Design a protein around this nucleic acid. Structure first.
Lengths: 141, 136, 153, 83, 203, 87
RNA sequence: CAGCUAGUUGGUGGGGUAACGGCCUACCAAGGCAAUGACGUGUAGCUAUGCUGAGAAGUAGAAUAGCCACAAUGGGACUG
RNA sequence: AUUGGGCGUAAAGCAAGCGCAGGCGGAUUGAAAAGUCUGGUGUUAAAGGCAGCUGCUUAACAGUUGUAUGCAUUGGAAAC
């Protein structure tokens, strides 16, 4: 509420979200802002339910024109972030598609990859549980 | 660079060349033509036999032969061993191998062939320089 | 504590009327249980340089953690444009690596591993890159603690 | 009766030739080595039997048939409205 | 050549008795220096990793009297199965028929034992064999062919001998069997299997 | 006649014929349609086991076997399950 | 290697072919391919596969097997 | 160097701009299902590669059983 600042979205949703997280992690920032998109909303939801970041609130103006989402990153009392390294595999013009049997494992399962097969964004381990493959969004560990 | 660019122009390999090309080309009679079948080692008939000096770091009087292969090629060659039996248009046999001291020379005569008799009185390893085993 | 050297180097700085031949050595120190350190020093003679290098290495030691005798997640060591890769080898393959990499991993009390040299091959940069790659290893229990999924997740 | 058919929606270029029209289809395939997704075009020949006059810019379907002539090997079966 | 003429030259340089302990057992003031004119003092000034890998290899293979490609074939055979590579390798190196003959104690030396196998004096599983590269499994009977018992040396060999725990034999009836797979500690400890197994980047 | 016939797939001195159904105008041990057991005329005591299921399918739609196949079909009893069904 | 293609593209009646068909024929038309590579130069039988590699892929298409083409060179047709 | 490289001083950012075709590309709703994933069926000759077994006095080898990989058809999923 009352953000008193103009914010715009960079480019394709996957790349825009990751860069903000990485820069905030490197600069020890805690709060960031970006324009909202249902793909980005879903990936932020699965990220927070995988325990990598704090509160996200999706915000709408006093109209049905613009929707934005702001999300806080998980930290510690000793000021060490939970996010270690983010890398997107999907890329504009380099759409990557692996079957279920070739589903990657990020750092021997320690990390989390976003794989939106048929039911929205959906974690790799529950993907193996449902044995369905598809789009590979990004590696997060 | 970008994937959308290499589709237009795929990468090209270096395509390194052979270390010694003379032994590779060959030509027959009866509509002669080159067929470059990369034969291991050819023979030839010597045309000029003399001596030449090596380059900067070394100093000697190395003996060489200007041999002509079965085809029309002329290649420099180093004559190893103690002495030689090159006899002014006598047929010999060749083998690849580069010598640093002699520019241009990139071949060796196999000693133990048709006319080039092997080094006499050589009992160390006896295989190079075409030496027979001495009587026990 | 085996203290196996890796690469001694013959270094010398010029000086008016002569060459100050003062060669240097590099050593690796490891207790075969998790203690690892390295140290580079220079002296006029082999024993003096070896003693100085051992003192420097053993004075500054640092620990590593072992899980089934191997690294458990692949990590790349970026340091000084000389990359070194580690991979969680299965229990049977045994130790395979170059010279300095084998020295470090063997003195680290380790076992089976997969490595491949990238970039340059100067021993000091390889040691730095391998150490960086092995210490940026983030423990599974650590990420379990710093996440809400500590219960085997 | 295992007869087949290829569902190839195309873009007819013109009916300039006598009662024959050229159909263009932009098939999408995966690059053999670089894994990118690209599209290629190839012209298909067909004959106007007389029921429709496929002008420039219409989009139609393609079915297999006997070879009616050299380079003319497919005919019109099902047609969708104009553009 | 499957036979090496000189045997003490191996025990001197390699620092390991090819036999049990009799290679340098004070025979004519037995020494331990390397053979040749240059045995004065060359102890350790360039001893590198490749050198010790070769040394362990040579300690392991010439002791069994094997050649290079044959032992490489043995490695390719043992790599076919799943298990501990070093223990499986050394078990394969212990399953040789001529090696088992020494474990039976029928010959004073392994070199002698390998000779009886060739000439047919050793009969295995009721069918005579004459190849030293047989791979034996547990529970295989071995006999002296019931022929050529009257060797003035086999009696002096089967009389007194050290029978290892992992095999059992009967001295009088000249009958034995391969009871079980030997353990590493039951054999001489001067062979570190790890160096030999990790030096093979050949395959 | 698509002819069930023997193929010498094997090493020298140790032949191993495999009974197979192949066209008559096809060389030995060449391309074939279907595989019918095999023969090892070195091991004795009924070393000629076959499939017996698709062999009947082959015979029932046209196939002339060879003389060597006669024993390999009679010992198992292919004739005693074919001749009366043929009628 | 920037234009190539005049039975080349389409239709009408007929002939011929085991069969569809510019395959051919009498007539009427001027189209078809081509920067996502036509035409031309050079090289090469293709494939299952051998070798190397960890893998993507590189390499030669050994033995053998499937297919294709040939039987000194260039053409023609009979029997079937 | 798609996975798996670089372009300040080491080879490498065209002298700059206007730019069609190409690639890429804001947010929300609906459909279709071309990409994408998945189930069934057919096929992907045999030999060879891999694993197990048998037989050559044991291996080299031969036989034996299973084994990948793609393609086409059909039935669904709708996140990009």
């Amino acid at each position: 509420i009352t953000t008193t600042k103009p914010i715009k979205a960079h480019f394709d949703p996957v790349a825009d979200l990751l860069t903000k997280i990485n820069n905030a992690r490197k600069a020890k920032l805690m709060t960031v802002t970006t324009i909202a998109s249902k793909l980005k909303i879903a990936i932020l939801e699965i990220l927070v339910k995988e325990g990598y970041l704090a509160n996200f609130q999706v915000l709408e103006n006093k109209s049905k024109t613009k929707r934005i989402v702001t999300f806080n990153l998980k930290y510690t009392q000793r000021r060490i972030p939970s996010i270690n390294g983010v890398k997107q595999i999907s890329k504009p013009g380099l759409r990557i598609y692996r079957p279920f049997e070739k589903l990657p494992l990020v750092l021997n399962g320690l990390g989390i990859a976003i794989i939106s097969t048929s039911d929205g964004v959906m974690t790799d381990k529950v993907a193996r549980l449902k044995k369905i493959g598809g789009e590979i969004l990004a590696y997060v560990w | 660079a970008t994937i959308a660019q290499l589709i237009r122009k795929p990468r090209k390999k270096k395509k390194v060349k052979s270390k010694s090309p003379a032994l590779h080309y060959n030509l027959n009679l009866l509509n002669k033509k080159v067929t470059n079948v990369y034969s291991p080692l050819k023979r030839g008939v010597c045309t000029r036999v003399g001596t030449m000096t090596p380059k900067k770091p070394n100093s000697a009087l190395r003996k060489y032969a200007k041999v002509r292969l079965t085809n029309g090629f002329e290649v420099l060659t180093y004559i190893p061993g103690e002495g030689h039996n090159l006899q002014e248009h006598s047929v010999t046999l060749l083998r690849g191998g580069r010598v640093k001291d002699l520019p241009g020379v990139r071949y060796h005569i196999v000693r133990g062939t048709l006319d080039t008799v092997g080094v006499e009185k050589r009992r160390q390893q006896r295989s190079a320089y075409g030496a027979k085993k001495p009587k026990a | 504590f085996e203290e196996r050297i890796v690469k001694l180097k013959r270094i010398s700085k010029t000086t008016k009327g002569g060459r100050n031949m003062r060669f240097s050595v590099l050593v690796v120190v490891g207790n075969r249980k998790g203690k690892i350190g390295y140290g580079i020093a220079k002296a006029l003679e082999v024993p003096n340089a070896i003693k100085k290098a051992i003192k420097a290495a053993h004075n500054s030691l640092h620990t590593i953690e072992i899980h089934k005798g191997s690294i458990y997640h692949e990590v790349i060591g970026r340091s000084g444009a000389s990359r070194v890769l580690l991979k969680p080898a299965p229990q049977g393959t045994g130790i395979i690596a170059g010279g300095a990499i084998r020295a470090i991993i063997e003195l680290a009390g380790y076992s089976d591993i997969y490595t491949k040299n990238l970039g340059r091959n100067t021993p000091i940069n390889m040691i730095h890159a391998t150490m960086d790659g092995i210490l940026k290893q983030l423990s599974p229990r650590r990420v379990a603690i710093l996440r809400n999924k500590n219960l085997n997740e | 009766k295992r007869n087949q058919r290829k569902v190839l929606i195309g873009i007819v270029k013109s009916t300039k030739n006598a009662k024959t029209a050229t159909v263009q289809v932009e098939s999408r395939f995966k690059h053999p080595l670089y894994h990118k997704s690209v599209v290629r075009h190839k012209k298909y020949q067909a004959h106007n039997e007389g029921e429709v006059l496929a002008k420039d810019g219409d989009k139609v379907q393609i079915v297999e048939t006997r070879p009616l002539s050299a380079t003319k090997r497919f005919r019109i079966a099902k047609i969708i409205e104009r553009a | 050549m499957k036979y090496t003429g000189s045997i003490f030259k191996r025990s001197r340089r390699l620092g390991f008795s090819l036999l049990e302990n009799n290679k340098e057992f004070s025979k004519g003031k037995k020494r331990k220096t390397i053979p040749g004119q240059h045995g004065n003092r060359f102890r350790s000034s360039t001893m590198s990793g490749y050198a010790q890998q070769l040394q362990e290899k040579q300690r392991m293979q010439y002791m069994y009297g094997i050649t290079d490609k044959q032992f490489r074939r043995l490695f390719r055979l043992v790599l076919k199965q799943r298990g501990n590579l070093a223990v499986n390798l050394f078990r394969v190196l212990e399953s040789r028929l001529d090696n088992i003959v020494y474990r039976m104690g029928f010959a004073p030396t392994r070199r002698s034992a390998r000779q009886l196998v060739n000439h047919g004096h050793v009969l295995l599983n009721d069918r005579t064999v004459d190849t030293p590269s047989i791979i034996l499994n547990p529970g295989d009977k071995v006999r002296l062919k019931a022929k050529t018992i009257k060797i003035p040396i086999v009696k002096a060999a089967s009389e007194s001998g050290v029978v290892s725990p992992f095999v059992e034999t009967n001295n009088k009836t000249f009958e034995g069997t391969y009871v079980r797979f030997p353990e590493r500690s039951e054999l001489p400890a001067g062979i570190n299997e790890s160096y030999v197994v990790e030096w093979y980047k050949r395959l | 006649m698509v002819k069930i016939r023997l193929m010498r797939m094997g090493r020298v001195h140790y032949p191993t014929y495999r009974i197979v159904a192949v066209d008559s105008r096809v060389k030995r041990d060449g391309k074939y349609i279907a595989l019918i057991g095999h023969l090892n005329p070195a091991l004795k005591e009924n070393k000629c086991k076959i499939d017996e299921a698709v062999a009947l399918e082959w015979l029932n739609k046209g196939a002339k076997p060879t003389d060597t196949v006669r024993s390999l079909f009679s010992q198992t009893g292919l004739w005693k399950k074919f001749v009366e069904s043929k009628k």
